[PDB]
Glutamate receptor 2 (Rattus norvegicus), 102 residues
Amino acid sequence: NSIQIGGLFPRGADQEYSAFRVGMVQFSTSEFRLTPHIDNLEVANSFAVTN
Amino acid sequence: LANPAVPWGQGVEIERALKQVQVEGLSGNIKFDQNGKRINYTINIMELKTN
Ligand SMILES: *[C@@H]1O[C@H](CO)[C@@H](O)[C@H](O)[C@H]1NC(C)=O
């Protein structure tokens, strides 16, 4: 039950990704498991976001 | 979208070419600064009257 979900963290966002992993650990379940792919980028950059 | 994006060299030259232009046109004197905004223009101030 692998669920692929993309994610976007602005470079310099740390505590957000931390709380993100903590959320992943606490809300993890035997039924299904979320499989995030993280890519850090410039959030203000439209090109980077599109890519 | 191919990552990492690679720009062509010629582009910078074409940009400079476009920005360095000074011509006469329907908008009056046409010239640009480094950022590409209009410089040395004339905006006619008009009033609607009876005639
Ligand atoms: C042309 O535009 C530039 C930018 O605003 C200004 O510095 C300069 O004085 C202008 N030249 C004339 C002759 O109006």
Remarks:
- The CA atoms of residues 15 and 36 of chain A lie 17 Å apart.
- Chain A touches chain B through three residues (CB under 8 Å).
- Helices of chain A lie at 15-26, 46-50.
